């Protein structure tokens, strides 16, 4: 045993993994073994989901988060998101699970049997954290790997069956994307969109053409960026701006993942394009809009003139104006007028919700969908009792959107803590005071008093 | 075929369990490493063969 | 459901997802065996 | 004999017993009394 106790490593058992900072072979084992855990979960969880899956029930009634990810890619589903073939789900699960053994093997080997350090064994695989060119080279390899990944999504969408399109004319269906958006003014225009209401930054992406073309751009940007980083070494300004150490690099990645986690939270909460409501359930905004639609339909069937119906406050009971004048659903859902969904858009005209269309053109399928969504709003208790806090037991439901938003907020938040923890520590360690103040060289004692 | 598939998948599970315990134990054991090395190679080859066997036989039972 | 040919391995599939948690716990068993040195 | 059964085994077995009993308690939340059914 070398470096495997506190006295020799300087790190207590609870910070045991910090013993790995300068042991590249064991550290590679740690990473490969960990990747095996991720892949293990993706496989085993999928198989669990499939084993419990009742095809005629909506996925979102079944506590599924992974099968919806597979379905969104166009595998296993047909028109309206109906499940036509569960075998693709099985394949994804099995192959991941099988693959996890291989990674597990490599991880366990490198961690406890292979060379503890890689530097004497291999110039290529060995590395020093302070070697800036080697660090950017490994980064470059991974950027290429990621760029290829993004192009695989493009490949599925364009050449291998397509993706599930909730917006498909005539109703939601799998659709091959023939004409992806390449126009950089559209693709990069998303990035400059305000994150606030009615805009929603990149979370606003509302068609698959933009999604696919975005990944073409990202695929090529990552590959180009990767090549760039293999062939160059950090510039002077970059060298003076950053801390160069394993812990510093960890901290930058922690900050990045925190940011990403927060973005994914808002994505699953608001976006119904790459998270189709057919699989994930309605968004909070959607279900609220759908309740107003439901009672507009019901009450209009009963004889109500929904355009002229004055509510208790003086605002329209069913329909009112947005602050810029568009016709929108009334009641509290006034806040959700930015919502856009395939069941609702047919009633929308240039001025907003069209009274003529509302009076004449609401189809039973729209009524069904609104009723489905109103009663599958993403509200529920920790023990999975669906609905508001005051509901009695009966409906076993918490929306996949709630599970996914909450989990990723928790994760993103702790990863921000982790960033601050490691970024702060990396600064202190590089400057040489991470273990405490030198009693004989206490900086404050050499400074003038403040007063 | 169904009985072949059944036993091949059963063997895959059993071997997996044996490897799960055996590989780490062998990797961290002082003696019998020469004996261990070849068994791990044999275990791995057989494990891969069984995956493919279960993979193919899948289509003649489903 | 899983394909019928796999039905017997169903109770095993039900328990696999928890395995990652067991890895975290295993680290503590191991550390206890080496006295948390 | 004071020291024969290693402490790490006692901790692991004791811990596993706690998980089993608490796990049983959670199972009971979904079955029989207090299950809402």
């Amino acid at each position: 045993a070398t470096n495997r106790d506190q006295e020799s490593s300087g790190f207590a058992w609870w910070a045991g993994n910090a013993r790995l900072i300068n042991l590249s072979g064991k550290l590679l084992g740690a990473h490969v073994a960990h990747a095996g855990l991720i892949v293990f979960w993706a496989g085993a969880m999928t198989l669990f989901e499939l084993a419990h899956f009742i095809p005629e029930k909506p996925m979102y009634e079944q506590g599924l988060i992974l099968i919806p990810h597979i379905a969104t890619l166009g595998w296993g589903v047909g028109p309206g998101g109906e499940v036509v073939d569960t075998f693709p789900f099985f394949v994804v699960g099995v192959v991941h699970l099988i693959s996890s053994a291989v990674l597990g093997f490599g991880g366990v080997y490198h961690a406890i049997r292979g060379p503890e350090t890689l530097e004497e064994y291999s110039s290529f695989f060995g590395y020093d954290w302070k070697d800036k060119n080697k660090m950017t080279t490994i980064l470059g390899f991974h950027l290429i790997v990621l760029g290829i990944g993004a192009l695989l999504l493009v490949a599925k969408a364009m050449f291998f069956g397509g993706l599930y399109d909730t917006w498909a004319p005539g109703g939601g269906d799998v659709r091959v994307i023939t004409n992806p958006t390449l126009d950089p003014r559209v693709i990069f225009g998303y990035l400059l969109k305000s994150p606030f209401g009615g805009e929603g930054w990149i979370v606003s992406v509302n068609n698959l053409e933009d999604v696919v073309g975005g990944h073409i751009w990202i695929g090529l940007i990552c590959i180009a960026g990767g090549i760039w980083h293999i062939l160059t070494t950090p510039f002077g300004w970059a060298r003076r701006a950053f801390i160069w150490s394993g812990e510093a690099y960890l901290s930058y990645s922690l900050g990045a993942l925190s940011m990403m986690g927060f973005i994914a939270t808002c994505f699953v909460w608001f976006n119904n394009t790459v998270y189709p409501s057919e699989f994930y359930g309605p968004t909070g905004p959607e279900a609220s809009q759908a309740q107003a639609m439901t009672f507009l339909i019901r009450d209009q069937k009963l004889g109500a003139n929904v355009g002229s119906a004055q509510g208790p406050t003086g605002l329209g009971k069913y329909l009112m104006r947005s602050p810029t004048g568009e016709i929108i659903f009334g009641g509290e859902t006034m806040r959700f007028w930015d919502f856009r969904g395939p069941w609702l858009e047919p009633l929308r005209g240039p001025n907003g919700l069209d009274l003529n269309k509302i009076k004449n053109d609401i189809q039973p399928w729209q009524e069904r969908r609104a009723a489905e969504y109103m009663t599958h709003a993403p509200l529920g208790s920790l023990n999975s009792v669906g609905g508001v806090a005051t509901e009695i037991n009966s409906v076993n439901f918490v929306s996949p959107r709630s599970w996914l938003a909450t989990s990723h907020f928790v994760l993103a938040f702790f990863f921000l803590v982790g960033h601050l923890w490691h970024a702060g520590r990396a600064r202190a360690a590089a400057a040489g005071f991470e273990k405490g103040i030198d009693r004989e060289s206490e900086p404050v004692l050499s400074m003038p008093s403040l007063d | 075929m169904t009985i072949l598939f059944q036993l091949a998948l059963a063997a895959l599970v059993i071997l997996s369990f044996v490897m799960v315990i055996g590989v780490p134990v062998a990797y961290a054991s002082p003696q019998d490493w020469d004996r261990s090395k070849q068994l791990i190679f044999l275990g791995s080859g057989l494990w891969i063969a069984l995956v493919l066997v279960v993979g193919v036989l899948n289509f003649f039972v489903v | 459901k899983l394909p019928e040919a796999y039905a017997i391995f169903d109770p095993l599939v039900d328990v696999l997802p928890v395995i990652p948690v067991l890895f975290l716990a295993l680290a503590f068993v191991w550390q206890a065996a080496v006295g948390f040195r | 004999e004071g020291g024969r059964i290693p402490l790490w085994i006692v901790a692991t077995v004791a811990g596993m017993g706690v998980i089993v009993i608490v796990g049983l308690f959670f199972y009971g939340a979904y079955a029989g009394l207090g299950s809402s059914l």
Binding site: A1, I112 | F17, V20, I21, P24, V25, A28, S29, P30 | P11, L12, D14, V15, V18, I19, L22, F23, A25, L26, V29, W30, A33, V34 | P6, W8, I9, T12, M16
Partner: peptide
């Protein structure tokens, strides 16, 4: 069936501590 599930988890559950126990007895590189 609950017994089959419990049997599976018990065998998977023991596997980890077993690895450690076997290595401790064999004076392995823990």
């Amino acid at each position: 069936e609950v017994i089959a599930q419990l049997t599976m988890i018990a065998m998977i559950g023991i596997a980890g501590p077993m690895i450690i126990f076997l290595l401790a007895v064999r004076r392995g590189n823990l």
